Write an enzyme that holds these catalytic residues in place. Structure first.
Site, mmCIF file in Angstrom:
data_model
loop_
_atom_site.group_PDB
_atom_site.id
_atom_site.type_symbol
_atom_site.label_atom_id
_atom_site.label_comp_id
_atom_site.label_asym_id
_atom_site.label_seq_id
_atom_site.Cartn_x
_atom_site.Cartn_y
_atom_site.Cartn_z
ATOM 1 N N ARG A 150 19.074 14.494 1.520
ATOM 2 C CA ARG A 150 18.988 13.726 2.750
ATOM 3 C C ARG A 150 20.403 13.156 2.846
ATOM 4 O O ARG A 150 21.147 13.142 1.851
ATOM 5 C CB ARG A 150 17.969 12.592 2.622
ATOM 6 C CG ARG A 150 16.529 13.052 2.460
ATOM 7 C CD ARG A 150 15.568 11.860 2.361
ATOM 8 N NE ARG A 150 14.169 12.247 2.141
ATOM 9 C CZ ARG A 150 13.718 12.935 1.088
ATOM 10 N NH1 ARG A 150 14.547 13.336 0.133
ATOM 11 N NH2 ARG A 150 12.424 13.213 0.980
ATOM 12 N N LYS A 152 11.663 5.874 -1.570
ATOM 13 C CA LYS A 152 10.563 4.925 -1.364
ATOM 14 C C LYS A 152 9.890 4.936 -2.743
ATOM 15 O O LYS A 152 9.749 3.898 -3.395
ATOM 16 C CB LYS A 152 9.624 5.446 -0.255
ATOM 17 C CG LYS A 152 10.348 5.670 1.091
ATOM 18 C CD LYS A 152 9.605 6.642 2.015
ATOM 19 C CE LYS A 152 10.479 7.088 3.206
ATOM 20 N NZ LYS A 152 11.694 7.891 2.831
ATOM 21 N N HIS A 194 18.726 14.455 8.922
ATOM 22 C CA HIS A 194 18.136 15.556 8.171
ATOM 23 C C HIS A 194 18.616 16.948 8.539
ATOM 24 O O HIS A 194 18.338 17.908 7.813
ATOM 25 C CB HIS A 194 16.610 15.502 8.282
ATOM 26 C CG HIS A 194 16.002 14.256 7.708
ATOM 27 N ND1 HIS A 194 15.446 14.209 6.445
ATOM 28 C CD2 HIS A 194 15.876 13.008 8.221
ATOM 29 C CE1 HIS A 194 15.006 12.987 6.202
ATOM 30 N NE2 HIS A 194 15.255 12.238 7.264
ATOM 31 N N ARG A 216 19.950 19.117 5.841
ATOM 32 C CA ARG A 216 18.940 19.513 4.866
ATOM 33 C C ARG A 216 18.033 20.594 5.457
ATOM 34 O O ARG A 216 17.676 21.565 4.762
ATOM 35 C CB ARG A 216 18.159 18.305 4.338
ATOM 36 C CG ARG A 216 16.845 17.990 4.994
ATOM 37 C CD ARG A 216 16.141 16.841 4.254
ATOM 38 N NE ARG A 216 15.903 17.157 2.846
ATOM 39 C CZ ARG A 216 14.910 16.657 2.111
ATOM 40 N NH1 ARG A 216 14.039 15.807 2.643
ATOM 41 N NH2 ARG A 216 14.793 17.001 0.835
ATOM 42 N N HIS A 223 9.577 17.645 -2.390
ATOM 43 C CA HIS A 223 8.391 17.562 -1.554
ATOM 44 C C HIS A 223 7.157 17.337 -2.404
ATOM 45 O O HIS A 223 6.813 18.166 -3.245
ATOM 46 C CB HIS A 223 8.250 18.807 -0.690
ATOM 47 C CG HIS A 223 9.024 18.729 0.584
ATOM 48 N ND1 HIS A 223 9.820 19.756 1.043
ATOM 49 C CD2 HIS A 223 9.118 17.740 1.505
ATOM 50 C CE1 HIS A 223 10.368 19.407 2.192
ATOM 51 N NE2 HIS A 223 9.958 18.188 2.495
ATOM 52 N N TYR A 264 8.886 25.406 6.640
ATOM 53 C CA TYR A 264 10.016 26.342 6.545
ATOM 54 C C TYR A 264 9.540 27.756 6.245
ATOM 55 O O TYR A 264 10.323 28.715 6.272
ATOM 56 C CB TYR A 264 11.000 25.892 5.455
ATOM 57 C CG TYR A 264 11.569 24.519 5.705
ATOM 58 C CD1 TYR A 264 12.470 24.298 6.752
ATOM 59 C CD2 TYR A 264 11.175 23.434 4.936
ATOM 60 C CE1 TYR A 264 12.956 23.031 7.028
ATOM 61 C CE2 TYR A 264 11.656 22.160 5.203
ATOM 62 C CZ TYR A 264 12.548 21.961 6.252
ATOM 63 O OH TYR A 264 13.021 20.690 6.524
#
Ligand code: MG
Ligand code: MG
Lengths: 170, 168
Positions: free
Chosen positions: B38, B61, B111, B114, B137, B146
């Site tokens: 990111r 986070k 983003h 990325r 992820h 993707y």
């Protein structure tokens, strides 16, 4: 029984040998179809001549989106019976018999899924793309295929090989 | 709707970057385009997170931590200092993108680099599962976005099945 059992090469070949000597001449082919495509037992057992075509097989339950076409080798295709309608008679009972002669131990009620498990297990182990696998087995979601992910030889060194910076795809 | 860049755009972006008043812009950009970091993960990269041919991104986070390998040439051109390797290259980034005449939907800027990594990774024949880890992820669902870049090859079933080629 937390494990989704699958056969290894040695088991696979001993199972086939026993299957090929089954008093039911269709077993061998049914097992082979399963191992080669990952089809569910009934899907291969009830196969009809119209699902077979020069180097591929189509599985369908109800027209209601359950139409998968799985490519097979020329070798397998050529082994299939040329007659119309249902290619084989029921062979499950003979299967249980073959598996026992091959000294194959399996969790309660797993004899039915074992071949499909084997196919998926090896597909992934062989470096097969899990996205291709989801289609082959006909899973409505990828979460279903995720049960086979741990077999995928993971190699992060690909980030250097496939990133846009050094190797732009386009 | 996720936007990403193509080779031609990438070359013009790097070019507008190798001309930025901010000397770090070009470096941070190359990091995101090679690992899918990111923006902030690379922008605030600290010296300890860097090791010979691999970078360890961290807590966004959830106190995350993953390590994406990189090329010698990318490493060899990193600040050899200590602490935060760079400054705040975000405004400089916007500047470069604009100068490159690159159009992007609102907030896609953080983003985009990325997305570009992912898209191309998948297009180049990359394993979705690998890409999953590479981007940190938690769920394969996020990475699934993707999947469509993945070249589908069902003929592989003929070479990967346990009847003909049992793995062991
Ligand atoms: Mg019985
Ligand atoms: Mg501003």
């Amino acid at each position: 029984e937390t494990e989704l059992a699958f056969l290894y090469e040695r088991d696979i070949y001993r199972l086939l040998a026993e299957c090929d000597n089954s008093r039911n001449p269709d077993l061998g082919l049914i097992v082979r179809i399963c191992l080669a495509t990952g089809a569910r037992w009934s899907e291969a057992e009830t196969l009809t001549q119209s699902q077979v075509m020069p180097y591929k097989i189509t599985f369908t339950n109800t027209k209601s989106k359950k139409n998968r076409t799985v490519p097979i080798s020329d070798e397998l295709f050529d082994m299939l019976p040329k007659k119309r309608g249902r290619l084989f008679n029921d062979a499950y009972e003979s299967f249980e018999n073959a598996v026992l002669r091959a000294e194959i131990e399996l969790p309660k009620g797993q004899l039915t899924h074992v071949l499909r498990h084997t196919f998926a297990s090896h597909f992934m182990m062989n470096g097969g793309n899990i996205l291709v696998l989801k289609e082959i087995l006909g899973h409505s979601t990828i979460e279903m295929t995720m049960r086979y992910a741990h077999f995928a030889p993971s190699h992060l060194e690909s980030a250097v090989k496939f990133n846009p910076l050094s190797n732009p795809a386009q």
